[PDB]
Symmetry: C5
Subunit: 249 residues, 5 copies
């Protein structure tokens, strides 16, 4: 029942697409879990969607731990992934370990960190100590104010033992090559359907914000009269390989 | 008084060491009076005492508190305290600070989880007067995250000066080889009978949880009239080498 | 509309001068944004202009964070650059990162640090982790007691060292290099050599942009302004007109004039 | 007058035995000072004698600073030596320095640390920064829960690092003798024989405050006298006459 | 007017003796500044003259910052030098920097640290980051318990070690090198060898300047002062005049006299 890293490995081998959605509260976490969502991402994207800030930089380790605890009270079988917030882990591998440990004590089953080859040593340090790491490469929103290289980043984390490699806004053809090159499962957002799974910010896919949605995002609320049905459709289109479509790439 | 030297003599003589977890003073005095030689204040208290789903949320404060409670009840038995998740893996210096607090709380030895990558930490602590029990094989703090590696882990800790090597859920024949290879006494749980001693979580062996006991666990309460007799039977079986039996091994 | 690092790079390539001014409050930040200031510098110069102290050394990270938040609530399109205060970042690249992360969480889009080649590793450490860096070379006011005051840099055989400081920061990935009190001809060479945009104060008009302390250019202090500073309030009808004349003279390359250059 | 490291060096050179005793309070420290005790050791042994614990490991840095302050208000001429408590200085030489600096600020004139060769770097670090160090080798109570050439190596490494004094506990007398003869600094012993430049005893032990058999290498000096003052003076006289340890 | 490092360098080259005195309060600081004292030393000597302790070791960084602030409210032209107190800087160059930064934030224009060649790296770390350093060599009072009291330095084969200490600091960028209780002939050779000004106390008249503890030179203690100290209060009936006499004798090279030199 419970989704573990082995489960994700089996899904990658079986070619069965993984469904990930961000979650910041207990009620929505339980709803998504029950709707088939396999990975619950307590992302630092909550700085915009929950806190209403202009970027994710101000989110603190305290905020991430609080939301992790909330989500942990609602989740059952889904795996809880928590982001390491800006400033809380890039100082050193030792600082990253301390911040990751706090998230794990709050209820996370894996942590997500941003960065390329320069973060590979941090991934290894954490994974060796029992903390599953999700390496976030490509577009890394914490550096918002700031092909071979992406492949290198991917490989570096894989070699260090990252459990999952997540790619944001990447040429679909490159995401495909990456997914085939790394031993660990991959998760995409604006990276195509050749990844081992997909992720989207709940709020975006529920159409909580006015005006058009990002190009790589699909509104799943539309056509449904219940949030649970909207999420179920997401899981199904992810697995059907219908999402992302050609328009979302 | 049970000391490291006592354990060493027992290994050399083939006399099995009886270890049991303990998180409270009353149970600790009872186990001590019932012949338990090593009291393990383990982070297993996150599940048995705190009721969590894992031992990761256990803090250093929690370990020091439980160690202090056990220390008020213990007499002859050695107190072993676990370094909790996040409090010692950052560096050897951080592990020494955390272990120093546990020793200050009443521990006579500390236990830490990890393979070869933690051996340098074992050496740093042992050289500074802090006896270390290196816990290898199935390390519960890594639940969310292979025969030769285990052997490598055991050798590295032994060479680093580990006072004791504890193995959890390890193929029996592998455990026997490790035990015959390292110089320090070995303790097992789900590791077979060829270790120098055994450990079990108190509540498990007392049948506190409903349902079937884990495979490597035996209910010692059953067939006895008191907690005292259940514990004495556990100690007597470990020493008679009747526990664990074929049915409790992998 | 929003001013980003790419905007500055496009302006350097086009030869359009960048207008930077200091800002420590929300109302003045909004006034300057509306008057066309592109970069709003929350400088540690507030230790003197706001706090009334004799130098910028006593300014703390908390003071820097507070003013940054204030300015962030008034800014609109302009980029916010916040100074890393004395004592909060020179201890190590790790300490600099932590201090810079607090400023970015306070609302900064870039941080400014003082120092030559010995700070380039710090610049690299921060930029690689998403924190845009402005390297400030030449006369660095946090080292005022070591310099003994405000002297022009790059004289004689000191030119190479300044050039070396600029290069190390640029190679370390500095987004912008800021020069203060530097021989104009040297600043021109530096600007023509580094890949990143440059900003000057008392560095001549051949930098890719200019900066002035608000209070200096508004003639808030009694007496005369420094030689490299022009009083724009004087001869103008409002604070809004004074700032607009500054941005216009910077873009027309009339400020700094010959009188304001070393 | 005042007892300085120079005083101790001169005493070793002349063969005049040094009297050291533990002290954790102001009143007893002033009494011992007046009785001729030259070195007052504020030891982590207070964890057992004062606090009543089973070991000295739980003694904290705050406890050592407190007792150091108390003793410093009683002491006049004697040198105050303060122990660096378990867990407060073994993390690194930088940590030891911060802990030693707190003890010096509380009134100590020298600090004592436990450990062989692996602690010599720490000794060098502290001594180079003005903190006199007493290196404690042999039996080190802080490692209670956890050979001739090893002892000599430890003593030599500490002496080469600049230790002001080397303290030996429970060492074969003949071996203590060689160490004393080979190091440039004064040596102090406890259960180390009379061939040391000086002796130390825990005050409560030599005053017979503990119920039970007197420790083997300890002599009860309270016996035969009717004042604590006379008991201390007798210990100092026997140490000087080289009749203790017997 | 305003005393800077450049001023001290100009005086060394000119042969004009620098007058330094300790100061722990604002009133006395203003008086000395008005009497011509060029360097006001907020020394850890306040542990004995102000706090009444037996040594300067118990003085904390907080104490140093507090007195530094007091002195800064009275100082006008004089340069404020603050001592780094025992335990606050010897742990590492990084810790020395953090402590030195607090002193500078409290009002100091330079910090003073005790130590030989082993502290030179710390000297370099500080000066490069804008903190002027006065290296104190010879008899370093924070090491009094290791020293076994106060004793003359530099005789025999120890002379070369002292020279090394001074040159190591001079090479690291020390702004000033202070010598306490060193053979006069050695102090002279060191003064003629390093590039920075030198200040002495019990080091002869050939240093570039002198320093005394205020309370010692005002005769505040009972009995006699050390051999290298002179009571300037005697023969005068105002502290103003007593301080002016110190300044005059230092500049005339009449103090220290033969009787105050080793
Ligand atoms: C877009 C996803 C991967 C994310 O980083 C977040 O929600 O924080
Ligand atoms: C039983 C042993 C393996 C243990 O770690 C614990 O109780 O925490
Ligand atoms: C650009 C200059 C004037 C500066 O550093 C400041 O204002 O803080
Ligand atoms: C006498 C001078 C050099 C001093 O160190 C002090 O006052 O602290
Ligand atoms: Na994120
Ligand atoms: Na455990
Ligand atoms: Na500035
Ligand atoms: Na001083």
């Amino acid at each position: 029942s419970l989704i573990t890293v082995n489960t994700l490995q089996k899904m990658k081998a079986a070619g069965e697409k993984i469904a990930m959605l961000t979650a910041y509260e207990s009620s929505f976490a339980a709803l998504m879990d029950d709707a088939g969502v396999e990975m619950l991402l307590v992302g630092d994207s909550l700085g915009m969607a929950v806190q209403g800030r202009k970027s994710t930089l101000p989110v603190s380790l305290r905020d991430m731990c609080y939301h992790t605890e909330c989500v942990a009270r609602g989740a059952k079988n889904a795996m809880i992934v928590s982001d390491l917030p800006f400033g809380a882990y890039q100082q050193s591998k030792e600082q990253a370990f301390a911040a990751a440990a706090e998230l794990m004590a709050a209820g996370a089953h894996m942590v997500k960190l941003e960065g390329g080859v320069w973060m590979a040593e941090t991934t290894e340090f954490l994974q060796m100590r029992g903390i599953p790491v999700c390496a976030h490469i490509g577009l890394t929103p914490q550096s918002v104010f700031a092909a071979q290289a992406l492949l290198n980043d991917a490989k570096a984390h894989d070699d260090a033992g990252a459990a999952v490699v997540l790619m944001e806004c990447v040429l679909a053809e490159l995401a495909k090559k990456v997914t085939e090159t790394v031993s660990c499962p991959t998760i995409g957002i604006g990276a195509g359907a050749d990844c081992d799974g997909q992720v989207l910010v709940m709020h975006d896919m529920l159409g909580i914000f006015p005006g058009k949605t990002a190009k790589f995002v699909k509104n799943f609320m539309q056509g449904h009269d219940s949030v649970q049905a909207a999420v179920r459709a997401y899981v199904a289109e992810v697995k059907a390989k219908t999402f992302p479509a050609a328009e979302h790439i």
